Design a binder for these strands. Structure first.
Ligand SMILES: [K+]
Ligand SMILES: [K+]
Ligand SMILES: [K+]
Ligand SMILES: [K+]
Ligand SMILES: [Mg+2]
Ligand SMILES: [Mg+2]
Ligand SMILES: [Mg+2]
Ligand SMILES: [Mg+2]
Ligand SMILES: [Mg+2]
Lengths: 209, 163, 288, 172, 49
RNA sequence: GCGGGGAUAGCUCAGUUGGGAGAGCGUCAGACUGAAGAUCUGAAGGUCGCGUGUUCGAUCCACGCUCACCGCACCA
RNA sequence: GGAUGCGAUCAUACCAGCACUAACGCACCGGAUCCCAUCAGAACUCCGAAGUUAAGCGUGCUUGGGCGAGAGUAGUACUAGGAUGGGUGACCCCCUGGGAAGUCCUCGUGUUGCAUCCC
RNA sequence: UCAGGAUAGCUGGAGCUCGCGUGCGAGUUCUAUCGGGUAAAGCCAAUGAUUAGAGGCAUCGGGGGCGCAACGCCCUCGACCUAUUCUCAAACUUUAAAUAGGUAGGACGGUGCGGCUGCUUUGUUGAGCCGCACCACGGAAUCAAGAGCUCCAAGUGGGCC
RNA sequence: ACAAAGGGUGUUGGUCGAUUAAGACAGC
RNA sequence: AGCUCAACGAGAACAGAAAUCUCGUGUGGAACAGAAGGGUAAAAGCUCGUUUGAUUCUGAUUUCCAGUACGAAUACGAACC
């Protein structure tokens, strides 16, 4: 039914997204990109691990779904269903075609066969945020997910706080100075701009960090 | 014709600049064009009359005629093994006075002045300008030196802003 | 809630119009069509007769366009007509005619063509065009009405008639002069002369003084104060025209500019003062 | 700089009477005649903009009529309408732009004798309240926005109605 | 039997064998195509010189 | 593997200019008859294949999947 | 130091909210016989000068939005030329050169021509 | 018309007009000026696609509880608004390279006088052109087995790496 | 004129950790 | 010549998601015959008035290109509107 992934591993064509020109495209195999305690606060999961691609290639939606399922299952089995948050950081937007074998190569432009994601070198594939006590479990879950993807991947322990853009020390210092507003999983840094009356007492600052 | 329309492949070439559409400033119509002036051809996408063919867009030429609303421009065009001096007529909205010879007259005037002074003092000089040549030796005052060394590698810094 | 309309993206994509269009003072289509000159005529300038009507004044000038900006060859104002003897009704048809005649005489004197081109000293209501002379052609200017509505019997056309009688070649037709009949495609010279001499104002004055004397006083207090009656308006306008013809040269003000100009508007705050005020406000907000 | 300036007085700029009838023909002509005999001016017909099958209207079908009145006639018409309404207006009847309005079911209440052939017609009254100086937004040359402080607000319109007409505003 | 459709291969080399030649510009260029009224006035001025 | 039509009560089907869930069998009950047969009446019976989107509103319109039916394609 | 008429550039000039302005002006403003115009003297047109700086115009402020400049992003991304370079490949290092763009941070919020007028 | 032909290009022969470094030139740089929308980048900018949560809101959504109802109250999920957020585009884009493209760098120049016009101007005001006088060290580098012009004609018009 | 994902307690260099002469690991 | 579109907010009996009317915001998110891309806001869009330059004469140029023709288009000249 489906060709082996080796037929579409390498990025050879220009992006071919679903649009008004490309119609009749099947839906991706992966539809959920966040699993675990996605509603947990930013301040509860400081530890972050990334499964990062090291190859320029195409990753299929089926492979993404399988990797997500495996990682989520192992994380739930090991650390529990409320001890982690897993985010798939790649969306398959490239449509892969197929020339179903009228005769020969005449009119060979293929019809949409599937969807996949174009991944660059060093691109994050999977992210897991949890407490310091589940770091090894997260690393092993990512290592298990590794076998579901083609090419080469690497597990990298992020220096950032959870899924935020601040390092752990910087985030701690900003919170100590009261410059951090929790926004779901994200964190908002307070500057020295905007309407002064819009700042609550103690949240107004003369100069930025 | 023959598979390509007059304005084929002009989506970007003939479009107007971002946030620069609408009415045309009066400076465009307050310009003076004379025979022999060098002009740059820049198509205004809002003026559909007297529009030059897309080839002449972005090219400089010389004025050979002046009509009520347009000017004649002579533009070089390469066709196989020769250059053709093609003469076209273009509305002034699509043309702009060129700066390709702004300094020529100034340089000639200065060269004439220098030659006159040299003749007055009884000397022979060359007014030709020269390309930038090697500089002579000089002394640099010793100051504090900062040592640069190769940076130890850290995989965590391979991503912009860190992983 | 209701989505915000004036969004950041809206402002980012916004393109401002020309400043004069934003202020609603210049119609740039008309301006370009008026000023654009044939290129094979090179630096030949096109002069335009600009006439504008304020709430209490009439401004008339001859202007030529340039990259740096418009240049005024000559200008005449209705506020200067009291020197010639017109003290009331400075924003009426007769005042517009007087201003046009004054500007025509002034520009002809500037060009030293007043002797060659004199026009007709008498006003008259018939359509008139100065006859070209052997020595030189008459001075030419193109009317610039502006944003006003070009209706029959407009003060701008009264000023155009004034300029034409002064002796300027202004391309025009007779379909908009006061007295032109819509039903009959003819110009009533009698009615046009009446409007030129302000006889419509005289008729209104007579009707008001016969119907409602108190309204007559309220409406024409200035006329009564200056002691001008309905019957004297024609003679007063004739005298004003005679004075304008006799001496059209502009008068140079004898006032001396002040040595120092006092400032009545607030000056932009300096960076240090702004920073100090901001520090005060921030400290006040934090201390709470 | 004070609110006591005579230039800040609120006056009724205009009163618009509207009669929107789905069908066009004899009924529309009768409604236009009612508007004309009520206002003293020839009314203006309004055509449909789109086609709606449920309403039974068609594009460019003249499905309404209306008239704009200014001055003493408008003031008298507004007084008659408020008399019909018992000088009772809802708080929601006032808009945020210093304008208000209401509606009446029977025009005979305005002083017109019933005619069975004509029938019975309801109408929509709308009053626009403005201060002097609004011409800056209507004039052709130098069109500008009226100062927001000088613009008539909902509170200003409600206060004007209460003071002039001694009316009562109900929340409900 | 299908064949090649098009290519610019070798065309620049062919052109450069003898080109790219620039026609010699003479001091006086042809007046054809210029404003006829201006040309008429110039002819009359030349005749009356 | 492609191109078409179909998926609706226990069963067989209609339906849509989008605003009603409906017919004929099957079951139950009532009416009628001296009793039956036939007949008539009433009741029950619907994730309108699944998941999305457009709409104020979707069985209806569009997209992707699932289940069955029909038709596929010469010279050697 | 400004205003007005006509402009050049066409946001450092725009948008929003607040505060202020001597004089001349610009305005708001009073009427509809006339020219003119509409359902509507609202607009347009004509005739005026009772009243007002309330509005418009102008100026100033906002840890405002936008806009413009700089720093940084970053010698990063990308890229012209070289290799009997590494690598199974995907891709990539090195050599001779060129070299961006968001986020974040700082600053600024018009400059001007002609003519008339007030100071 | 598709295994062909003509046509232009590529080539030979014949020459002719000049020239000897003072060079009407150049598949090259330099200097000064123009045009571009590919690579990249962007969505926290328009169009389109797309993940997640956070804080608020409704006489106008699906529910639970307290209730005969209530424009009565408290919560859940949905819509909506605000500030954020993951990931995208050959037929999207503010911004925007590298390479490459065009023009110019004097003897066919400049300056000062006078003249011609039926064109142009209110105006011997301009626009071109024509005469006289003077100046003009050749006006960036490198190279220049030289530059220009014409006639007749072959073969080729299956390519391939 | 080919070789991959996964592996090796074969061996050879490096990186980050843990115990140790108040005595590191295995057997008594 | 006059006017400004789509859309949204707040209001008005029937009238509601959708009829007509009032105010405010509104960079074009409308419309411009058709495919798509450009272009246009006191307009190139909508309404109205007057009209037939959709007229006559030949030449020049651009696109295609052999620098042939046809089609289409552009700038002048000579007339009448
Ligand atoms: K793998
Ligand atoms: K970018
Ligand atoms: K976007
Ligand atoms: K051949
Ligand atoms: Mg004020
Ligand atoms: Mg700001
Ligand atoms: Mg042959
Ligand atoms: Mg290229
Ligand atoms: Mg128009």
């Amino acid at each position: 039914g489906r060709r082996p992934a080796r037929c579409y591993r390498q990025i050879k064509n220009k992006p071919y997204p679903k649009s008004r020109f490309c119609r009749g495209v099947p839906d991706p195999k992966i539809r959920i990109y966040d699993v675990g305690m996605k509603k947990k606060g930013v301040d509860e999961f400081p530890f972050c691990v990334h499964l990062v691609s090291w190859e320029k290639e195409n990753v299929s939606s089926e492979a993404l779904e399988a990797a997500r399922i495996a990682c989520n299952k192992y994380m739930t089995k090991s650390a529990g269903k409320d001890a982690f948050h897993l985010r798939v950081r790649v969306h398959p937007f490239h449509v892969l075609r197929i020339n179903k074998m009228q005769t020969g190569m005449r009119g060979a432009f293929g019809k949409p066969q599937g969807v996949c994601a174009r991944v660059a070198i060093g691109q994050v594939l999977l992210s897991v945020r949890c407490k310091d006590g589940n770091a090894n479990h997260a690393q092993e879950a990512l290592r298990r997910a590794k076998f579901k993807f083609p090419g080469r991947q690497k597990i990298i322990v992020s220096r950032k706080w959870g899924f935020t853009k601040f390092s752990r020390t910087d985030y701690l210092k900003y919170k100590s100075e009261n410059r951090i507003i929790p926004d779901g999983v994200n964190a908002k840094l307070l500057g020295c701009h905007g309407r002064l009356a819009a700042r609550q007492p103690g949240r107004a600052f003369l100069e930025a960090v | 014709p023959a598979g390509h329309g007059l304005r084929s492949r002009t989506r970007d070439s003939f479009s107007r600049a971002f946030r620069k559409k609408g009415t045309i400033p009066l400076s465009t119509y307050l310009r003076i064009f004379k025979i022999g002036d060098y002009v740059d051809i820049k198509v205004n996408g809002a003026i559909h009359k007297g529009m030059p063919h897309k080839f002449y867009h972005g090219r400089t030429g010389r004025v050979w005629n002046v009509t009520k609303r347009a000017v004649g421009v002579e533009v070089n065009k390469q066709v196989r093994n020769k250059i053709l001096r093609k003469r076209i007529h273009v509305r002034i909205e699509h043309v702009q006075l060129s700066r390709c010879t702004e300094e020529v007259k100034e340089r000639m005037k200065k060269n004439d002045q220098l030659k006159a002074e040299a003749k007055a003092r009884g000397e022979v000089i060359s007014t030709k300008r020269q390309p930038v040549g090697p500089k002579p030796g000089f002394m640099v005052e010793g100051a504090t030196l900062e040592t640069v060394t190769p940076i130890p590698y850290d995989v965590v810094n391979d991503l912009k802003g860190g992983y | 809630f209701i989505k915000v309309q004036k969004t950041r993206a809206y402002f980012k994509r916004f393109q401002v119009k020309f400043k004069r269009r934003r202020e609603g003072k210049t119609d740039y289509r008309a301006r370009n069509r008026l000023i654009n000159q044939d290129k094979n005529k090179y630096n030949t300038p096109k002069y335009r007769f600009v006439v504008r009507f304020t709430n209490k004044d009439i401004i008339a000038q001859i202007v030529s366009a340039s990259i740096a900006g418009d240049m005024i060859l000559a200008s005449a104002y209705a506020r200067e007509l009291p020197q010639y003897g017109l003290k009331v009704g400075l924003t009426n048809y007769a005042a517009a005619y007087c201003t046009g005649l004054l500007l025509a005489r002034r520009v002809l004197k500037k060009l030293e063509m007043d002797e060659e081109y004199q026009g007709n000293p008498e006003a008259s209501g018939e359509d008139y065009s100065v006859e070209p002379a052997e020595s030189r052609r008459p001075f030419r200017a193109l009317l610039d009405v502006g944003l006003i509505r070009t209706t029959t019997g407009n003060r701008v056309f009264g000023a155009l008639k004034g300029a034409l009688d002064g002796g300027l070649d202004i391309p025009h037709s007779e379909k908009r002069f006061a007295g032109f009949s819509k039903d009959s495609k003819q110009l009533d010279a009698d009615v046009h002369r009446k409007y030129i001499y302000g006889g419509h104002v005289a008729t209104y004055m007579k009707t008001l003084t016969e119907d409602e004397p108190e309204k007559y006083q309220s409406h024409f207090s200035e006329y009564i104060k200056q002691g001008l009656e309905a019957d004297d308006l024609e003679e007063m306008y004739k005298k004003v025209h005679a004075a304008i013809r006799a001496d059209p040269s502009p008068k140079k003000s004898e006032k001396q500019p002040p040595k120092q100009h006092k400032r009545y508007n607030l000056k932009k705050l300096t960076y240090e003062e702004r920073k100090a005020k901001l520090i005060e406000r921030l400290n006040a907000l934090n201390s709470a | 700089k004070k609110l006591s300036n005579p230039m800040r007085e609120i006056k009724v700029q205009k009163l618009v009477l509207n009669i929107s009838v789905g069908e066009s023909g004899d009924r529309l002509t009768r409604a236009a005649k009612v508007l004309e005999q009520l206002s003293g001016q020839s009314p203006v017909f309004s055509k449909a903009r789109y086609t709606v099958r449920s309403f039974g209207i068609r594009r460019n079908e003249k499905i309404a009529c209306y008239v704009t009145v200014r001055g003493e006639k408008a003031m008298q018409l507004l007084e008659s309408g408020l008399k019909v309404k018992e000088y009772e207006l809802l708080r929601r009847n006032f808009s945020e732009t210093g304008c208000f309005g209401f509606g009446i079911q029977e025009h005979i209440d305005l002083g017109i004798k019933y005619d069975p052939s004509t029938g019975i017609y309801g109408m929509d009254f709308y009053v626009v309240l403005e201060r002097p100086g609004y011409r800056v937004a209507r004039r052709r040359r130098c069109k500008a926005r009226v100062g927001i402080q000088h613009r008539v607000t909902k509170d200003d319109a409600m206060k004007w109605f209460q003071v002039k007409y001694e009316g009562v505003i109900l929340n409900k | 039997a299908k064949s090649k459709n098009h290519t610019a291969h070798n065309q620049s080399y062919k052109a450069h064998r003898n080109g790219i030649k620039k026609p010699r510009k003479h001091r006086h260029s042809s007046t054809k195509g210029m404003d006829p009224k201006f040309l008429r006035n110039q002819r009359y001025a030349r005749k009356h010189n």
